[PDB]
From a paper:
We determined the crystal structures of the myosin VI-HCBD in complex with the [name] domain from [name] and GIPC2, respectively. There are five copies of both myosin VI-HCBD and [name]-[name] molecules in each asymmetric unit, arranged in an alternating pattern. The group of five HCBD and [name] domains repeats itself in the neighboring unit cell, yielding a continuous array of alternating HCBD and [name] that extends throughout the crystal. Considering one [name]/HCBD pair as a unit, the neighboring units in the array are related roughly by a five-fold right-handed rotational symmetry and a ~22 Å translation. The bivalent interactions between the [name]-[name] and myosin VI-HCBD are mediated by two distinct interfaces. Interface I involves the two loops in the [name]-[name] domain, one between helices α1 and α2 and the other between helices α3 and α4. These two loops interact with Arg1084 and Arg1085 in the ‘RRL’ motif on one side of the second helix in the myosin VI-HCBD. In addition, hydrophobic residues such as Val1088, Tyr1089 and Trp1092 on the same side of the second helix in the myosin VI-HCBD dock on the hydrophobic patch formed by Tyr275, Met276, Ile278, Leu283, Phe311, etc. in the [name]-[name] domain. Interface II is formed on the opposite side of the HCBD with helix α4 and the N-terminal end of helix α3 in the [name]-[name] domain. Interfaces I and II bury ~1300 and ~1100 Å2 solvent accessible surface area, respectively.
Residue numbers in the entry:
A (entry chain B): 1050 to 1096
B (entry chain A): 260 to 333
Write the structure that this text describes.
């Protein structure tokens, strides 16, 4: 969605994931949830 | 100071990202301990940990948290 989903708390994401029936919002939250872990992966392997 | 600061911040990490890291959190404490406003903190976070896209409210809570540590709010 045209939400700025970087503003959301980790709780927020996980919750709307297994609550919402909005498929668009779903994929969007699932992606954000991913992004943050992907970025943390990139930081870990460097330092 | 610093030890209680890291905790307060690492908790803010967990609540943002779902993971926990006393190191990454300490990087952030060290980064912004001696700044003068949340923007200076933001500018320094952007240097190294830029890719996280840390939201303003996060950068506020970290500014807030580190502030509380120099005071004794624990």
């Amino acid at each position: 969605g045209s939400h700025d989903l970087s503003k959301w708390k980790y709780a927020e994401l996980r919750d709307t994931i297994n609550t919402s029936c909005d498929i668009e919002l779903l994929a969007a939250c699932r992606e954000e949830f991913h992004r943050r872990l992907k970025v943390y992966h990139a930081w870990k392997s460097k330092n | 100071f610093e030890e209680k600061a890291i905790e307060k911040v690492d908790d803010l990490l967990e609540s943002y990202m779902g993971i926990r890291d006393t190191e990454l959190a300490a990087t952030m404490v060290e980064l912004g301990k001696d700044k003068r406003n949340p923007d200076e903190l933001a500018e320094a976070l952007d240097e190294r940990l830029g890719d996280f896209a840390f939201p303003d409210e996060f950068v506020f809570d970290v500014w807030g948290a580190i502030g509380d540590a120099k005071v004794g709010r624990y």
